[PDB]
Design a protein around this ligand. Structure first.
Ligand SMILES: Cc1cc2nc3c(=O)[nH]c(=O)nc-3n(C[C@H](O)[C@H](O)[C@H](O)COP(=O)(O)OP(=O)(O)OC[C@H]3O[C@@H](n4cnc5c(N)ncnc54)[C@H](O)[C@@H]3O)c2cc1C
Ligand SMILES: Cc1cc2nc3c(=O)[nH]c(=O)nc-3n(C[C@H](O)[C@H](O)[C@H](O)COP(=O)(O)OP(=O)(O)OC[C@H]3O[C@@H](n4cnc5c(N)ncnc54)[C@H](O)[C@@H]3O)c2cc1C
Ligand SMILES: Nc1ccccc1C(=O)C[C@H](N)C(=O)O
Ligand SMILES: [Cl-]
Ligand SMILES: [Cl-]
Lengths: 447, 451
């Protein structure tokens, strides 16, 4: 039986552990954190995530989809909140088949851990990777208190997140050709209780957004009617606009409260613990990191956030990481050797990871807020008339398994076609709809 | 009138002498060598240099550009000689306005000497600087016979080259924070006569390169159709590769001939005096020398090769030295005092000199390996499309350095963004037809601000 060591019992690491173990591999998985299945007297994390068709299909192949979806809330559309105006619901599709699922991160992780152990994987918690000796095929792990221990390895999988220790170790033996692109927005996680969401009639079966230009809030629902809110705001005010809101200006919870009362007036009354949440939860960092290569011969490979950190504005990081886990297990299972498997996995996934990283950056403007309204109106008519040809980019990314690079290329043809059709036209009445449709049939092959 | 003493009537020294003298400064310029304008029975042999936009603009400001260009050969592009295919011409840019000029060193120096004297500078030849007493504000000079003489000075400019005597003297009063980085390649100059270049149809209006990985040849044309071929090759073979070519393995001219016949077959028949040139011309040494400071209060400053020796792989040493002369004259003319001028000149120029020193080291792989690589060819093709679509955002690094006056550090920083963008766009793609050009252009607009 072939041997493998995986670092990081997160989302990609735990899924790939189950896929390899059920195919007869000897799997050992190491995780820095404690086992979340061991109940303690501590609170429990409220982190939520949007699970889309790519992630759901990966779980389906692993035989875990039904168990995960039993604990997920259906989001039928986007609820856009602009002050004074009643919240406006934008459905995703025509029926409940085109939906996004809101899943609690730690509930999903527990299901994945049980799934990996049921398949035969051995999981070791409270052990963080410190360094790797590639020549000697040994690695060094330690607990939170610094006690160190060495382990021999044959194949190493880095599923250890955006600040991957496996990626750092690989830099000693290969040039990963890394390029880090910082993002000016930080993030802060806040909470809405079940009592507060019911009192203010906040729709449970929707994804909520409070656009505000250079800053915004989003909220995802939980099974118990509570919601997890995320604030996206610049860490610092730029030199050109020193008066503009930023985390630096919000000195404490009371400053944060005054900011929410002014800028998010319909949201502030639902955040009962705003002051406490603001001071106790740390401000998160966002970035895009692109690598030239993801592997070292047949010895080590990266996947998920360890290979391609992206900005969270398309809700696709976990979905991409689960898609990566399926592809890595498929290549490893049937290749001539580990070196061939790792090079083939990198060649397949790199162009698709680059495409979603680019589309996620673009999506910030679409979430944070007449010509666009005209193009949207025309696009909707084309989608209704040619459903196998004109498919909005958001739908190709969220509700299909079309490779990310293909969704990006087709979306470009669609945008170009809409741009020329609307150019130097005030409204829809001056546009020949049949001529635009003929151009759709002329430029977009059916899928 | 403000007084200044300059050491070295080279390229930077003679230009700064004209700029200061025409602005009313009392200028005295000291040079170790004899006056090259005095005709003797000796046979003078100097190389041709590549003059680009930075150097040409400096001469333009000085009113000397037309005189220099009348004696220069136009290089409309690069002629790459890769084994297995005929020589291929790569035009320099968008139009024939983006050219490099091949100018004889001695001819340029003579024009600069005439220009400095016309502006009022006094030039004293056959006097080499030996030492400086900074406390006493005196310096010591000598002739070749050894007779020494002292001179008082007020402001001292060190324009005295790679082995600067002013820089050595400054080490007695300040920590220059020097760091010397040796380079493994040596160099040898070889000749192509006007008869041989015409016989073999070698293009006169181009810069020629013969890439060969760890070694290579280059050739620049002269006004008379002769060319100087420079061979860049390791002094010694490394321990890991003892069989690899090196100067140590070429004991005599006959060994050099066999090497050229095997590895540069299209070049060997043009080098009639190969054997003689190899044995009589010494092997040159290459290096990068970096300093943290270039001045001593308001008393002395370095510029050109005296301040920043660099490897010759980007043809920018003279161009950088002439750019330094314009900046030094600008700071000295307008500052509150000499101390403020020298500190401001060093703060402005030191980061730009560090950037061209780094880009010159990087240009060796570009010329010797990348030019013959299909991935570089696909990258160049994609880069050309981006340059057409976004002309104020995507400007190829070679063009920013050679055909513009953008500060070298800015050309390097923007160049890194462009290198990464092209690398990720072409990765896992065989040709241009599978690349989403609009997606690449969006990365350009997001990452590169317009200039
Ligand atoms: C604000 C925000 C919102 C998001 N929303 C969404 C969304 O709606 N939908 C979506 O698809 N994605 C979303 N994402 C992205 C998503 O959270 C990640 O892309 C995903 O968790 C990556 O999965 P992974 O398994 O690669 O890494 P992770 O889930 O981060 O797992 C990495 C694991 O490695 C462990 N580890 C780390 N270092 C070591 C070490 N040295 N030794 C041992 N173990 C180690 C960690 O403890 C962890 O268990 C969001 C991200 C953010 C920040
Ligand atoms: C192989 C090679 C190829 C090159 N090709 C190019 C090219 O194509 N393009 C380009 O831009 N650059 C090129 N360069 C670089 C270029 O030659 C130099 O960077 C340039 O000459 C520096 O100008 P400078 O005025 O600072 O010094 P220099 O031109 O060297 O002048 C220094 C002067 O000081 C005098 N002097 C020295 N010591 C004393 C002393 N003690 N007392 C008095 N006088 C003294 C010298 O005699 C000389 O006249 C090349 C260099 C090499 C080695
Ligand atoms: N004149 C030189 C002397 C020596 C070595 C290079 C040059 C160059 O000018 C190279 C040119 N800048 C290039 O990139 O092709
Ligand atoms: Cl995400
Ligand atoms: Cl040079």
């Amino acid at each position: 039986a072939r041997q493998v060591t995986i670092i990081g019992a997160g989302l990609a690491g735990t899924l790939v552990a189950r896929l390899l173990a059920r195919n007869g591999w000897q799997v050992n998985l190491f995780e820095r954190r404690p086992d979340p299945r061991i109940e303690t007297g501590a609170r429990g994390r409220s982190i939520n995530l949007a699970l889309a068709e790519r992630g759901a299909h990966a779980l389906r192949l692993a035989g875990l989809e039904r168990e995960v979806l039993a604990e997920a809330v259906m989001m039928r559309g986007r609820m856009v909140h602009v002050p004074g105006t009643p919240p406006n619901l934008q459905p995703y599709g025509r029926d409940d088949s085109e939906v996004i699922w809101s899943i609690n991160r730690d509930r999903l992780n527990r299901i994945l851990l049980d799934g990996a152990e049921a398949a035969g994987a051995s999981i070791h918690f409270n052990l963080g990777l410190d360094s790797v000796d590639f020549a000697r095929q040994r690695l060094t792990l330690s607990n939170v208190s610094g006690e160190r221990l060495e382990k021999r390895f044959h194949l190493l999988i880095g599923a250890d997140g955006c600040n991957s220790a496996v990626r750092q170790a690989m830099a000693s033996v290969v040039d990963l050709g890394e390029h880090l692109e910082t993002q000016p927005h930080g993030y802060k996680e806040l909470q809405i209780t079940p009592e507060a969401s019911a009192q203010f009639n906040l729709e449970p079966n929707a994804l909520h957004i409070w656009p505000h230009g250079d800053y915004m809030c989003i909220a995802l629902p939980n099974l118990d009617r509570s919601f997890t809110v995320t604030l996206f705001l610049h860490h610092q005010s730029p030199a050109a606009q020193p008066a503009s809101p930023s985390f630096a200006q919000l000195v404490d919870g009371h400053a944060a409260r005054r900011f929410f009362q002014r800028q998010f007036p319909d949201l502030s009354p639902m955040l009962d613990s705003l002051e406490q949440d603001f001071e106790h939860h740390p401000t998160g960092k966002l970035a895009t990191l692109r690598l030239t290569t993801w592997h070292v011969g047949g010895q080590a490979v990266l996947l998920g956030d360890a290979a391609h950190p992206m900005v969270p504005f398309h809700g696709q990081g976990m979905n991409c990481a689960l898609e990566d886990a399926v592809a890595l297990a498929e290549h490893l299972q049937s290749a001539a050797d580990n070196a061939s498997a790792l090079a083939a996995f990198t060649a397949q996934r790199q162009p698709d990871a680059l495409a979603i990283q680019a589309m996620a950056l673009e999506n910030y403007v679409e979430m944070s807020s007449p010509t666009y309204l005209l193009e949207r109106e025309l696009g909707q008519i084309m989608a209704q008339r040619q459903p196998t040809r004109f498919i909005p980019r958001y739908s190709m990314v969220t509700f299909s398994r079309l490779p990310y690079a293909q969704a990006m290329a087709r979306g470009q043809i669609q945008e170009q076609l809409l741009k020329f059709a609307v150019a130097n036209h005030s409204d829809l009445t001056s546009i020949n709809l049949d001529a635009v449709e003929h151009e759709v049939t002329r430029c977009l092959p059916p899928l």
